[PDB]
Amino acid sequence: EVQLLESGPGLVKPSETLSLTCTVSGGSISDFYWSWLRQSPGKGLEWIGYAHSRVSAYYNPSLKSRVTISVDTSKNQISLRLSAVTAADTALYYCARQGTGTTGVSEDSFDLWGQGTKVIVSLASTKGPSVFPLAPTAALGCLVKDYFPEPVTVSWNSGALTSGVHTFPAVLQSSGLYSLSSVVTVPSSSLGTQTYICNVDHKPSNTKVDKKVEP
Amino acid sequence: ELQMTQSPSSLSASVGDRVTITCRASQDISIRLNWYQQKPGKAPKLLIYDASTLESGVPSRFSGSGSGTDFTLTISSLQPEDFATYYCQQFNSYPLTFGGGTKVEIKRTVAAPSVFIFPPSDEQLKSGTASVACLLNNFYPREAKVQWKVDNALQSGNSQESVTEQDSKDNTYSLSSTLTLSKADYEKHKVYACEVTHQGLSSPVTKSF
Amino acid sequence: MRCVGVGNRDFVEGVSGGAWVDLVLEHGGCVTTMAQGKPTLDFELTKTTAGGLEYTVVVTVHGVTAMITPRSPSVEVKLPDYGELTLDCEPRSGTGHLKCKVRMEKLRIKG
């Protein structure tokens, strides 16, 4: 029944302090050792450190000088503080329970995990996307260019078109903006009879653009 | 720190096959090793602890073996839900370290990519920039190379590639390469080619406009 | 500071098979624990608040700080590379000392 709820900002400016919160539900925070971990597609799964309500914390020597993990019994939450933040700290942060001889599954194993929080370290401002049609079985698409931050919800014909749809992962441009492309493979006979519209939604800038794709 | 080496990094397997994931330690870690399963979008889930002890709820097909430096994770008969990334974790010495992970992907027959070239739209050109997109549709294996050619001259650092994850139904990959150029650079040239090299192709296919 | 010796290096009694070691932690005093196949430890009662509402215990391997309060008298102490130990203490106000049941079953030698 013990559950971990993760909270904190998804975007942190460089040189600032990265603050994340892990709230404990349906149990006592005092009895367990609470750990913080991070994952990135090049550095892998990394253990940051652990903390206890009555026992002194222990951190990874690679982060020790910049990291602080605190347990708040009154607020029933665990906090992670990472100072002097850079693009190298951009990772999916996890809060987990570090097991003992009597608590958890086993000693130094992570049984209970948080949902995960995507943390992006960037100085870039929020900007709406500019959508352009990739005019044309035949293939046609939409180019979601110059936007910050991620993500962008791209659907075809207001959700009616599912088959052949390929929404590619975004790439970071030299400018610091993201560029995305969403394509669809449709029959050649359908061109001139069936109309195609890409519904692009960017929640942080509150931008909703629909573009007609035709040769 | 104690280094953990996992081999292979990527594994292509079929349902019902016996898969073995290896984990090597730089020091003797006794039986102090744990195994984790991670599915896309989800947090890692503990399968095996103390090198061989199975966690409650975990199916009997999952097995753990090894002591000291060499360790193995065995899935006796692979099931469709088992396609995930498997991690090994030591706890003999601090800091606690994890292996690189082994991504278990679904094996499939070779499929040649369908190449489609897209010129920059008139509405994009009026905004000052020009982007040429090349699409590689439904291919296997993931390994594919794209070469941009502005006439006969090969391009170097003005293009960006992106690959979608393996399709749930057809088990293929798709690639999108965007060639970024200024309005002046685009108007000064006429021939724009996209050369694609893949296992399913006898010779490299080129799509141009 | 000279420590009071508890246990023997040639004996496993009190550290194996559900057994514990009873210690009396004096303020301004030190206690040393010894056992077969276990690391030698130093137990010291560093600070005691007026109550005693908070007891500060420092565990050093031949340190890690553990807090003992009347609300939470028992705690699992992690000693990295050496395993774990349980401090099942009996806080009975500012008497100048702290009686603790030390469970060293999960302790190990680094090598």
Coordinates of C-alpha atoms in Angstrom, one line a residue:
Chain A
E1 CA 0.0 0.0 0.0
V2 CA 2.9 2.5 0.3
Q3 CA 3.0 4.9 -2.7
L4 CA 5.5 7.5 -4.0
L5 CA 4.3 10.7 -5.8
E6 CA 6.9 12.8 -7.7
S7 CA 6.7 16.6 -8.0
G8 CA 8.9 19.5 -9.2
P9 CA 9.6 21.7 -12.3
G10 CA 10.2 20.0 -15.7
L11 CA 12.5 22.9 -16.7
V12 CA 15.4 24.4 -14.7
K13 CA 17.6 27.3 -15.9
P14 CA 21.5 26.6 -15.8
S15 CA 23.5 27.5 -12.6
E16 CA 20.2 27.3 -10.6
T17 CA 19.3 24.7 -7.9
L18 CA 17.2 21.6 -9.1
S19 CA 14.5 21.0 -6.5
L20 CA 12.3 17.8 -6.6
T21 CA 9.7 16.4 -4.1
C22 CA 8.7 12.8 -3.4
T23 CA 5.5 12.4 -1.3
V24 CA 4.9 9.2 0.7
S25 CA 1.3 7.9 0.8
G26 CA -0.3 5.2 2.9
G27 CA 2.6 4.6 5.2
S28 CA 5.3 6.0 7.7
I29 CA 8.3 7.9 6.2
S30 CA 10.4 7.4 9.4
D31 CA 10.8 3.5 9.0
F32 CA 12.4 3.5 5.5
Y33 CA 15.6 4.7 3.7
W34 CA 14.7 7.0 0.7
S35 CA 16.9 7.1 -2.4
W36 CA 17.1 9.3 -5.5
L37 CA 18.1 8.0 -9.0
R38 CA 18.4 9.4 -12.5
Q39 CA 18.3 8.1 -16.1
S40 CA 19.6 9.5 -19.5
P41 CA 20.1 7.9 -22.9
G42 CA 23.9 8.0 -22.7
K43 CA 24.8 7.9 -18.9
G44 CA 22.3 5.2 -18.0
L45 CA 20.7 4.5 -14.6
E46 CA 22.7 6.4 -11.9
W47 CA 22.3 6.2 -8.1
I48 CA 22.5 9.8 -6.6
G49 CA 22.2 8.9 -2.9
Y50 CA 20.0 8.0 0.1
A51 CA 18.6 9.6 3.3
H52 CA 16.9 8.6 6.5
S53 CA 14.8 10.6 9.1
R54 CA 17.2 9.7 12.0
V55 CA 20.4 8.4 10.2
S56 CA 23.0 10.6 8.3
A57 CA 22.7 10.7 4.5
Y58 CA 25.2 9.1 2.0
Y59 CA 25.8 10.4 -1.5
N60 CA 27.5 9.3 -4.8
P61 CA 31.1 10.9 -4.8
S62 CA 30.4 12.2 -8.4
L63 CA 27.5 14.4 -7.1
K64 CA 28.3 14.7 -3.3
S65 CA 29.6 18.4 -3.5
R66 CA 26.4 19.6 -5.3
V67 CA 23.7 17.2 -3.9
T68 CA 21.5 17.3 -0.7
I69 CA 18.7 14.7 0.1
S70 CA 16.4 15.6 3.1
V71 CA 13.5 13.7 4.8
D72 CA 10.7 15.9 6.2
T73 CA 8.6 13.8 8.7
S74 CA 6.0 16.6 9.4
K75 CA 5.3 17.2 5.6
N76 CA 5.6 13.4 4.9
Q77 CA 7.9 14.1 1.9
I78 CA 11.6 13.6 0.6
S79 CA 13.4 16.4 -1.2
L80 CA 16.3 16.4 -3.7
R81 CA 18.5 19.5 -4.1
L82 CA 21.1 19.6 -6.9
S83 CA 23.0 23.0 -7.1
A84 CA 25.1 24.5 -10.0
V85 CA 22.9 22.7 -12.6
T86 CA 24.1 22.2 -16.3
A87 CA 22.9 20.4 -19.5
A88 CA 24.7 17.2 -18.2
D89 CA 22.1 17.1 -15.4
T90 CA 19.2 16.7 -17.9
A91 CA 17.7 13.3 -16.9
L92 CA 14.5 11.4 -15.9
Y93 CA 14.7 11.6 -12.0
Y94 CA 13.3 8.8 -9.9
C95 CA 12.6 8.6 -6.1
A96 CA 12.7 5.1 -4.6
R97 CA 12.8 3.1 -1.4
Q98 CA 16.2 1.6 -0.6
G99 CA 15.6 -1.8 1.1
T100 CA 17.1 -3.1 4.4
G101 CA 17.2 -6.4 6.2
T102 CA 13.7 -6.0 7.5
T103 CA 12.2 -3.2 5.3
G104 CA 11.5 -3.6 1.5
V105 CA 12.2 -6.7 -0.5
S106 CA 16.0 -7.0 0.5
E107 CA 19.1 -5.0 1.6
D108 CA 20.0 -2.3 -1.0
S109 CA 17.4 -3.2 -3.6
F110 CA 14.8 -0.8 -5.0
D111 CA 11.3 -2.2 -4.8
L112 CA 9.1 0.9 -4.6
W113 CA 9.6 3.5 -7.3
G114 CA 8.1 6.9 -8.3
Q115 CA 6.4 7.7 -11.6
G116 CA 9.5 9.6 -12.8
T117 CA 10.0 13.3 -13.5
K118 CA 11.6 14.6 -16.7
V119 CA 14.0 17.4 -15.9
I120 CA 15.4 19.6 -18.7
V121 CA 18.3 22.0 -18.0
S122 CA 18.0 24.9 -20.5
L123 CA 18.0 28.8 -20.6
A124 CA 15.7 28.7 -23.7
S125 CA 12.4 30.7 -23.5
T126 CA 8.9 29.3 -24.3
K127 CA 8.1 29.7 -28.1
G128 CA 5.1 28.5 -30.2
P129 CA 5.7 26.2 -33.1
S130 CA 5.5 27.0 -36.9
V131 CA 3.9 24.2 -38.9
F132 CA 4.6 23.6 -42.6
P133 CA 3.0 21.0 -44.9
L134 CA 5.2 18.3 -46.5
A135 CA 3.1 18.0 -49.8
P136 CA 3.0 14.6 -51.7
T137 CA 0.8 4.4 -51.9
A138 CA 1.7 8.1 -51.4
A139 CA 3.4 9.8 -48.4
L140 CA 2.5 13.3 -46.9
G141 CA 3.4 15.0 -43.6
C142 CA 3.8 18.2 -41.4
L143 CA 7.0 19.9 -40.2
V144 CA 6.6 21.3 -36.6
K145 CA 9.6 23.8 -36.6
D146 CA 11.1 26.3 -34.0
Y147 CA 9.5 25.5 -30.6
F148 CA 10.4 25.3 -26.9
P149 CA 10.0 23.2 -24.8
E150 CA 8.9 19.6 -25.5
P151 CA 6.4 18.0 -26.2
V152 CA 4.0 18.6 -29.2
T153 CA 0.8 16.5 -29.7
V154 CA 0.4 15.8 -33.4
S155 CA -2.7 14.0 -34.7
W156 CA -4.2 13.6 -38.2
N157 CA -7.9 14.5 -39.2
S158 CA -8.7 15.3 -35.5
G159 CA -7.9 11.7 -34.4
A160 CA -9.7 9.9 -37.2
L161 CA -6.4 8.8 -39.0
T162 CA -4.3 6.2 -37.0
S163 CA -2.9 3.8 -39.7
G164 CA 0.4 4.7 -41.3
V165 CA 1.0 7.7 -38.9
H166 CA 4.6 8.2 -37.9
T167 CA 5.4 11.0 -35.4
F168 CA 9.2 11.2 -35.2
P169 CA 11.1 12.2 -32.0
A170 CA 12.1 15.9 -31.9
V171 CA 15.7 17.0 -32.6
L172 CA 17.5 20.0 -30.9
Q173 CA 18.6 22.6 -33.5
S174 CA 21.8 24.8 -33.3
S175 CA 19.5 27.7 -32.3
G176 CA 18.3 25.8 -29.2
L177 CA 14.8 25.1 -30.6
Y178 CA 13.2 21.8 -31.4
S179 CA 12.2 20.4 -34.8
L180 CA 9.6 17.7 -35.3
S181 CA 8.2 15.9 -38.4
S182 CA 5.0 13.8 -38.5
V183 CA 4.2 11.7 -41.6
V184 CA 1.4 9.4 -43.0
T185 CA 1.3 6.9 -45.8
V186 CA -2.1 7.0 -47.6
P187 CA -3.4 5.5 -51.0
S188 CA -2.5 7.5 -54.2
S189 CA -6.1 7.5 -55.3
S190 CA -7.2 9.3 -52.1
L191 CA -5.3 12.5 -53.3
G192 CA -7.9 15.0 -54.6
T193 CA -10.9 13.2 -52.9
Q194 CA -9.8 13.0 -49.2
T195 CA -8.5 16.1 -47.3
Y196 CA -5.6 15.8 -44.8
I197 CA -5.1 18.1 -41.7
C198 CA -2.4 17.8 -39.0
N199 CA -3.7 18.9 -35.5
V200 CA -0.6 20.2 -33.8
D201 CA -0.9 21.1 -30.0
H202 CA 1.8 22.8 -27.9
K203 CA 0.5 23.1 -24.3
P204 CA 3.3 25.3 -22.7
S205 CA 2.7 28.1 -25.3
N206 CA -1.0 27.2 -25.6
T207 CA -0.7 27.0 -29.4
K208 CA -3.1 25.0 -31.6
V209 CA -2.5 25.0 -35.4
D210 CA -4.3 22.9 -38.2
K211 CA -2.7 22.8 -41.7
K212 CA -4.1 21.5 -44.9
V213 CA -1.8 19.1 -46.9
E214 CA -2.4 19.1 -50.7
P215 CA -0.1 18.8 -53.8
Chain B
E1 CA 33.7 3.1 -8.3
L2 CA 32.8 -0.5 -9.0
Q3 CA 32.2 -1.0 -12.7
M4 CA 29.4 -3.3 -14.0
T5 CA 29.6 -4.5 -17.6
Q6 CA 26.4 -5.8 -19.3
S7 CA 26.6 -7.8 -22.6
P8 CA 25.1 -7.4 -25.2
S9 CA 23.8 -3.8 -25.2
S10 CA 20.9 -4.8 -27.6
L11 CA 19.4 -8.3 -28.1
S12 CA 17.1 -9.3 -31.0
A13 CA 15.0 -12.4 -30.0
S14 CA 11.7 -14.2 -30.8
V15 CA 8.8 -15.3 -28.5
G16 CA 9.4 -18.7 -26.9
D17 CA 13.3 -18.4 -27.2
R18 CA 15.7 -18.9 -24.2
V19 CA 17.5 -15.6 -23.6
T20 CA 20.6 -15.2 -21.4
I21 CA 21.7 -11.7 -20.2
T22 CA 25.3 -11.5 -18.8
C23 CA 26.5 -9.1 -16.1
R24 CA 30.3 -8.8 -15.3
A25 CA 31.8 -7.1 -12.2
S26 CA 35.4 -5.6 -11.9
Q27 CA 35.7 -6.9 -8.3
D28 CA 34.3 -10.0 -6.4
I29 CA 30.8 -9.0 -5.3
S30 CA 29.8 -12.4 -3.8
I31 CA 26.0 -12.9 -4.4
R32 CA 25.3 -9.1 -3.8
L33 CA 23.6 -8.5 -7.2
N34 CA 20.0 -7.5 -8.2
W35 CA 18.1 -7.7 -11.5
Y36 CA 15.6 -5.1 -12.8
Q37 CA 13.1 -4.9 -15.8
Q38 CA 12.3 -1.6 -17.4
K39 CA 9.5 -1.1 -20.0
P40 CA 9.2 2.2 -22.0
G41 CA 7.6 5.1 -20.0
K42 CA 7.7 2.9 -16.8
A43 CA 10.1 2.9 -13.8
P44 CA 12.5 -0.1 -13.3
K45 CA 10.9 -3.2 -11.6
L46 CA 12.9 -5.6 -9.4
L47 CA 12.8 -9.3 -10.6
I48 CA 15.7 -11.1 -8.9
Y49 CA 17.6 -10.2 -5.7
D50 CA 20.7 -11.8 -4.0
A51 CA 21.9 -13.1 -7.4
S52 CA 19.3 -16.0 -7.5
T53 CA 16.2 -15.2 -5.3
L54 CA 13.0 -14.5 -7.3
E55 CA 10.7 -11.7 -6.1
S56 CA 7.0 -12.4 -5.3
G57 CA 4.7 -12.2 -8.3
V58 CA 7.6 -12.5 -10.9
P59 CA 6.9 -15.5 -13.3
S60 CA 8.9 -18.8 -13.0
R61 CA 10.5 -18.3 -16.5
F62 CA 12.9 -15.6 -14.9
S63 CA 16.0 -17.2 -13.4
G64 CA 19.2 -15.7 -11.8
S65 CA 22.6 -17.3 -11.5
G66 CA 26.3 -16.5 -10.7
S67 CA 28.7 -15.6 -7.9
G68 CA 31.7 -13.2 -7.6
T69 CA 32.2 -11.6 -11.0
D70 CA 30.2 -13.5 -13.6
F71 CA 26.3 -13.3 -13.4
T72 CA 23.4 -14.4 -15.7
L73 CA 19.7 -13.6 -16.1
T74 CA 17.8 -16.4 -17.9
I75 CA 14.2 -16.2 -19.4
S76 CA 13.6 -19.9 -20.2
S77 CA 10.8 -19.1 -22.7
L78 CA 10.4 -15.5 -23.8
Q79 CA 6.8 -14.1 -23.7
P80 CA 5.4 -11.1 -25.7
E81 CA 5.3 -8.9 -22.4
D82 CA 9.1 -9.6 -21.8
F83 CA 10.3 -7.2 -24.5
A84 CA 12.0 -4.6 -22.3
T85 CA 15.5 -3.3 -21.1
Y86 CA 17.1 -5.5 -18.3
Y87 CA 19.5 -3.9 -15.7
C88 CA 21.9 -5.5 -13.2
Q89 CA 22.8 -3.7 -9.9
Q90 CA 25.5 -4.5 -7.3
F91 CA 25.4 -3.6 -3.6
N92 CA 28.7 -5.0 -2.3
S93 CA 30.5 -1.6 -2.2
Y94 CA 29.4 2.1 -2.4
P95 CA 28.5 4.0 -4.6
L96 CA 25.7 1.5 -5.7
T97 CA 26.3 1.0 -9.5
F98 CA 24.1 -0.3 -12.3
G99 CA 25.0 -2.0 -15.6
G100 CA 24.5 -0.4 -19.0
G101 CA 21.4 -2.5 -19.6
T102 CA 20.3 -5.0 -22.3
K103 CA 17.4 -3.9 -24.6
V104 CA 15.4 -7.0 -25.7
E105 CA 13.9 -6.2 -29.1
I106 CA 11.7 -8.4 -31.4
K107 CA 13.5 -10.1 -34.3
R108 CA 12.0 -9.9 -37.8
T109 CA 12.8 -10.6 -41.5
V110 CA 14.6 -7.9 -43.5
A111 CA 12.5 -5.0 -44.9
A112 CA 13.8 -2.4 -47.4
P113 CA 12.9 1.3 -46.6
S114 CA 10.4 3.2 -48.8
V115 CA 12.3 6.5 -49.6
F116 CA 10.3 9.8 -49.9
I117 CA 11.9 13.3 -50.5
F118 CA 10.0 16.5 -49.5
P119 CA 11.0 20.0 -50.8
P120 CA 10.6 23.0 -48.5
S121 CA 7.0 24.6 -48.7
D122 CA 6.4 28.1 -50.1
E123 CA 5.0 29.2 -46.7
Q124 CA 8.3 28.1 -45.0
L125 CA 10.5 29.9 -47.7
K126 CA 8.6 33.2 -47.1
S127 CA 9.6 32.9 -43.4
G128 CA 13.3 33.0 -44.3
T129 CA 14.4 29.3 -43.8
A130 CA 14.4 26.2 -46.1
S131 CA 14.1 22.6 -44.7
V132 CA 14.4 19.5 -47.0
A133 CA 13.0 16.3 -45.3
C134 CA 13.9 12.7 -46.4
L135 CA 11.6 9.8 -45.2
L136 CA 12.7 6.2 -44.8
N137 CA 9.5 4.3 -44.3
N138 CA 9.1 0.9 -42.5
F139 CA 12.5 -0.9 -42.4
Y140 CA 14.4 -3.7 -40.6
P141 CA 17.2 -3.8 -39.1
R142 CA 17.5 -0.3 -37.5
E143 CA 20.9 0.2 -39.1
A144 CA 20.5 2.6 -42.1
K145 CA 22.7 5.4 -43.5
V146 CA 21.5 8.7 -45.3
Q147 CA 23.8 10.9 -47.5
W148 CA 22.6 14.4 -48.5
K149 CA 23.7 15.7 -51.9
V150 CA 23.3 19.3 -53.0
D151 CA 23.8 18.4 -56.7
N152 CA 27.0 16.2 -56.8
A153 CA 28.6 17.7 -53.5
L154 CA 28.2 15.7 -50.3
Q155 CA 26.8 17.5 -47.2
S156 CA 28.3 17.2 -43.7
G157 CA 27.0 19.1 -40.6
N158 CA 23.7 20.7 -41.8
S159 CA 21.3 17.7 -41.3
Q160 CA 19.6 16.0 -38.3
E161 CA 18.3 12.4 -38.1
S162 CA 15.5 10.9 -36.0
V163 CA 14.3 7.2 -35.6
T164 CA 10.9 6.1 -34.3
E165 CA 10.7 3.1 -31.8
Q166 CA 10.0 -0.4 -33.2
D167 CA 6.4 -0.6 -34.4
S168 CA 4.0 -2.8 -32.1
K169 CA 2.4 -4.5 -35.2
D170 CA 4.9 -4.7 -38.1
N171 CA 8.2 -4.6 -35.9
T172 CA 9.8 -2.0 -38.3
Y173 CA 11.7 1.3 -37.8
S174 CA 11.2 4.7 -39.6
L175 CA 13.8 7.4 -40.2
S176 CA 13.4 11.2 -40.8
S177 CA 16.4 13.3 -42.0
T178 CA 16.0 17.1 -42.2
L179 CA 18.5 19.2 -44.2
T180 CA 18.5 22.8 -43.0
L181 CA 19.6 25.6 -45.4
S182 CA 19.0 29.4 -45.7
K183 CA 16.7 30.9 -48.4
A184 CA 19.8 32.2 -50.3
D185 CA 21.6 28.8 -50.1
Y186 CA 18.4 27.0 -51.4
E187 CA 17.8 29.3 -54.4
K188 CA 21.4 29.2 -55.6
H189 CA 21.1 25.4 -56.3
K190 CA 18.8 23.1 -58.3
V191 CA 19.6 19.4 -57.6
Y192 CA 18.7 18.0 -54.1
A193 CA 19.4 14.3 -53.6
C194 CA 18.9 11.8 -50.6
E195 CA 21.1 8.6 -50.9
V196 CA 19.8 5.7 -48.7
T197 CA 22.0 2.6 -47.8
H198 CA 20.3 -0.4 -46.1
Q199 CA 20.6 -4.2 -45.8
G200 CA 17.3 -4.8 -47.7
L201 CA 18.7 -2.9 -50.7
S202 CA 21.1 -4.5 -53.3
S203 CA 22.5 -1.0 -54.2
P204 CA 22.0 2.4 -52.5
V205 CA 18.7 4.1 -53.6
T206 CA 18.7 7.8 -54.3
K207 CA 15.6 10.1 -54.3
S208 CA 15.9 13.6 -55.8
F209 CA 14.0 16.6 -57.1
Chain C
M1 CA 39.4 8.5 24.8
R2 CA 39.6 4.9 26.2
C3 CA 36.6 2.7 25.3
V4 CA 35.0 -0.1 27.3
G5 CA 35.4 -3.5 25.5
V6 CA 32.3 -5.6 24.8
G7 CA 32.6 -9.0 23.0
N8 CA 35.5 -11.2 21.8
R9 CA 37.1 -11.7 18.3
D10 CA 37.2 -15.5 18.8
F11 CA 33.5 -15.7 19.7
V12 CA 30.3 -15.4 17.6
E13 CA 27.9 -15.2 20.7
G14 CA 25.5 -12.2 20.6
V15 CA 26.0 -11.3 16.9
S16 CA 24.5 -14.5 15.3
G17 CA 21.2 -16.4 15.3
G18 CA 18.7 -13.8 16.5
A19 CA 20.9 -12.7 19.4
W20 CA 21.8 -9.1 20.4
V21 CA 24.5 -7.1 22.3
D22 CA 23.4 -5.0 25.3
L23 CA 25.3 -1.7 25.6
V24 CA 25.2 1.2 28.1
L25 CA 26.2 4.4 26.2
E26 CA 27.6 7.0 28.8
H27 CA 27.8 10.7 27.9
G28 CA 31.5 11.5 27.5
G29 CA 32.2 7.8 27.2
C30 CA 33.0 5.2 24.5
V31 CA 32.1 1.5 23.9
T32 CA 34.0 -0.9 21.5
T33 CA 32.3 -4.1 20.1
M34 CA 34.2 -7.2 18.8
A35 CA 32.9 -10.4 17.1
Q36 CA 34.0 -13.3 14.8
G37 CA 33.7 -12.4 11.1
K38 CA 32.4 -8.9 12.0
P39 CA 34.1 -5.4 11.9
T40 CA 35.2 -3.8 15.2
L41 CA 33.0 -0.8 16.0
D42 CA 33.0 2.4 18.2
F43 CA 29.7 3.4 19.9
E44 CA 29.6 6.9 21.4
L45 CA 26.7 9.1 22.8
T46 CA 27.7 12.5 21.4
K47 CA 24.7 14.8 22.3
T48 CA 21.7 14.6 24.7
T49 CA 18.9 17.3 24.6
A50 CA 17.0 18.3 27.8
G51 CA 14.3 15.6 28.2
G52 CA 16.0 13.5 27.0
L53 CA 14.1 14.2 23.7
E54 CA 17.1 13.5 21.3
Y55 CA 20.0 11.1 21.7
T56 CA 22.9 11.4 19.2
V57 CA 24.8 8.1 18.6
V58 CA 27.9 8.0 16.4
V59 CA 29.0 4.5 15.0
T60 CA 32.6 4.4 13.8
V61 CA 34.3 1.4 12.0
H62 CA 37.9 0.4 13.0
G63 CA 31.4 7.9 11.6
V64 CA 27.7 7.4 10.9
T65 CA 25.2 9.5 13.1
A66 CA 22.0 7.9 14.4
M67 CA 19.2 9.8 16.3
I68 CA 17.3 8.1 19.1
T69 CA 14.1 9.8 20.3
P70 CA 11.4 8.5 22.8
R71 CA 8.9 8.4 19.8
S72 CA 11.4 6.5 17.6
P73 CA 13.6 4.4 19.9
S74 CA 14.6 1.8 17.2
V75 CA 16.6 2.5 14.0
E76 CA 18.3 0.5 11.2
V77 CA 21.8 2.0 10.7
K78 CA 23.5 1.6 7.3
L79 CA 27.3 1.4 7.4
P80 CA 28.4 1.5 3.7
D81 CA 30.6 -1.4 2.7
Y82 CA 30.0 -3.0 6.1
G83 CA 26.2 -3.8 5.9
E84 CA 23.7 -2.8 8.6
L85 CA 22.9 -2.9 12.3
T86 CA 19.8 -2.2 14.5
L87 CA 19.9 0.1 17.5
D88 CA 16.9 -1.0 19.7
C89 CA 17.4 1.6 22.4
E90 CA 15.6 2.2 25.8
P91 CA 15.4 6.0 26.3
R92 CA 14.6 6.8 30.0
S93 CA 15.3 10.6 30.3
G94 CA 18.5 12.5 31.1
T95 CA 20.2 9.9 33.3
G96 CA 23.5 10.6 31.5
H97 CA 23.4 7.2 29.7
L98 CA 21.5 5.2 27.0
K99 CA 20.8 1.5 27.1
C100 CA 20.8 -0.1 23.5
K101 CA 20.1 -3.5 22.1
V102 CA 22.5 -3.8 19.1
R103 CA 21.6 -6.4 16.4
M104 CA 24.8 -7.0 14.4
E105 CA 23.5 -10.0 12.2
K106 CA 23.5 -7.9 9.0
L107 CA 27.1 -6.6 9.6
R108 CA 30.0 -7.7 7.4
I109 CA 33.8 -7.2 6.9
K110 CA 34.8 -5.0 3.8
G111 CA 37.9 -7.1 3.3

